[PDB]
């Protein structure tokens, strides 16, 4: 299968999840505070007439990050919920080949909510599982 994913970075590390679960992408501006909210969330924004929660991806994966550097909110779309992810730069749509996709889950510490790792001669594009990431926020 030829998978189409959205490529984007955090802290000099490439990441990506499918285009199937994308609403659009925007640049950060003031995020409305919600009182007594979970620590891995920034707040809420109004996007296309809907109230989208703005999650901080790196606090879900447990990876190192620098908060000021981030400025791109990637709005996702699942059947359960629609959620924005604050990150660094974005590339766009990257067609990946099944031949170059490794499925090992013990390679790095966030490998269980990662669907795999795309091998390449540039920065290694890690394939996430949107599903298991939304499954984390609702517990």
């Amino acid at each position: 299968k030829e998978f189409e994913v959205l490529s984007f970075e955090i802290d000099e590390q490439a990441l990506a999840f499918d285009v199937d679960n994308i609403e659009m992408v925007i640049e950060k501006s003031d995020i409305t505070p919600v009182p007594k909210s979970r620590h891995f969330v920034e707040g809420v924004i109004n996007l296309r007439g809907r109230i989208i929660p703005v999650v901080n991806l790196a606090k879900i994966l447990g990876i190192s990050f620098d908060e000021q550097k981030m400025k791109s909110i990637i709005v996702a779309r699942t059947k359960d919920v629609e959620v924005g992810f604050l990150v660094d730069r974005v590339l766009g749509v990257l067609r990946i080949t099944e031949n170059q996709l490794d499925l090992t889950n013990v390679s790095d510490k966030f490998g269980k909510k990662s669907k795999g790792l795309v091998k390449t001669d540039g920065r290694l594009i890690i394939y996430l599982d949107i599903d298991k990431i939304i499954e984390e926020i609702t517990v």
Binding site: T32, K36, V41, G49, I51, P53, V81, E82, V83, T138
Partner: protein
């Protein structure tokens, strides 16, 4: 002139367009107070005039009479009167009383099970009717009306009434309440045990008429639609049921209050009064504070505390909003009072469902998001 057919999907899209038009009214209004233009006020005011006319036309086609939905229900009562060999007159006064289409659909089979248990339970055969000297044919009444931000459904009979004296005794068997508490209670709180799930689960699998008295099935639905239900009964004066539900879908008349300049809306439908209180009059007897206002003592709560927002500095004269909950009412002390307006609830989604305190955001006229306080969610 002539009656035509419009399906609900077509009306659902028309409702969204009415929502996008209200946003455009507010965005011109933002632009107007931004640039301070006298001529643009006149242009907008005419738009706002036609839009008010359109809005109330769209509300009329959104609302439906209850007897348009309940059209087969007097026939069902006739067939159940025939089955049990009873004479009863059913009175239905619902043709001028309009209710929302999502509210009417969820409460219809609930209401049918209430009437179906009533024809068995409280409606008398002719021999027992004339044994008490009562008028020879039973009287069972459905009716409705409109009150403020709500529509009131009303059901009444001249039947047997309900065995309240036995219900408190049964409640002690089931482990529902204390006996010294049962002696404290007033009659309409005895009947409120018929709105407890699991107090009576008795049903018929032959009839399929609803469990219990056909009332805890209705109460769950009324609470689910954010309403409020009451009951009264007296032996051989019959029973009466009062059901209050919201006037329209999604729109919530509110009082906008602020904590550290953050907008939190307070439901005007639930309210009871607004007062400027002193901190020197706030006192305590048990674990939480109170204030004696109008001779009555009200259990005060600090908005900024239950939401966990830091209070920088303290001024003596505090603004308070008194809100009603259940049969009672508590005080909400606020930092600033902005100003009322009728807002429209927006969900925060699956990640924020857990929080009792707030069940919904809302979009203000400056494009700002403002959350709505849940009155039964705090306390």
């Amino acid at each position: 002139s002539q009656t035509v057919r419009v399906d609900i999907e077509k009306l659902d899209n028309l409702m969204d367009l009415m929502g996008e038009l209200v946003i455009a009214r507010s965005r011109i209004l933002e632009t107007l107070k931004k640039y301070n233009i006298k001529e643009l006020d006149e242009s907008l005011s005419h738009l706002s005039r036609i839009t008010l006319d359109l809005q109330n036309v769209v509300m009329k086609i959104r609302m439906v009479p209850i007897s348009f939905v309940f059209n087969r229900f007097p026939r069902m009562v006739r067939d159940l009167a025939k089955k049990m060999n009873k004479e009863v007159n059913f009175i239905m006064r619902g043709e001028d009383t309009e209710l929302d289409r999502t509210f009417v659909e969820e409460i219809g089979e609930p209401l049918l099970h209430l009437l179906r248990n009533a024809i068995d339970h409280g409606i008398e055969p002719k021999e027992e009717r004339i044994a008490k000297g009562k008028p020879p044919i039973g009287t069972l009444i459905l009716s409705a009306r409109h009150e403020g931000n709500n529509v009131v459904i009303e059901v009444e009979d001249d039947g047997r009434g309900i065995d309240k004296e036995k219900i408190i005794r049964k409640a002690i068997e089931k482990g529902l309440i204390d006996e010294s508490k049962a002696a404290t209670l007033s009659d309409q709180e005895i009947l409120n045990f018929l709105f407890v799930p699991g107090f009576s689960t008795k049903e018929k699998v032959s009839e399929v008429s609803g469990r219990g008295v056909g009332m805890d099935v209705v109460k769950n639905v009324v609470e689910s639609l954010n309403g409020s239900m009451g009951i009264e009964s007296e032996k051989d004066k019959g029973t009466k049921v009062t059901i209050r539900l919201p006037l329209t879908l999604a729109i919530i008349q509110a009082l906008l209050v602020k904590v550290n300049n953050l907008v939190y809306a307070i439901p005007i439908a639930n309210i009871d009064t607004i007062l400027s209180i002193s901190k020197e009059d706030i006192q305590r007897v048990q674990d939480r504070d109170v204030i004696v206002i109008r001779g009555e003592v009200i259990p005060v709560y600090r908005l900024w505390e239950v939401l966990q927002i830091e209070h920088k500095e303290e001024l003596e004269e505090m603004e308070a909003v008194i809100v009603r909950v259940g049969n009672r009412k508590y005080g909400i002390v606020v930092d600033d009072l902005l100003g009322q307006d009728d807002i429209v609830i927006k969900s925060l989604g699956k990640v924020f469902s857990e929080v009792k305190e707030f069940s919904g955001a809302a979009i203000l006229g400056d494009g700002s998001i403002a959350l709505i306080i849940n009155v039964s969610g705090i306390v």
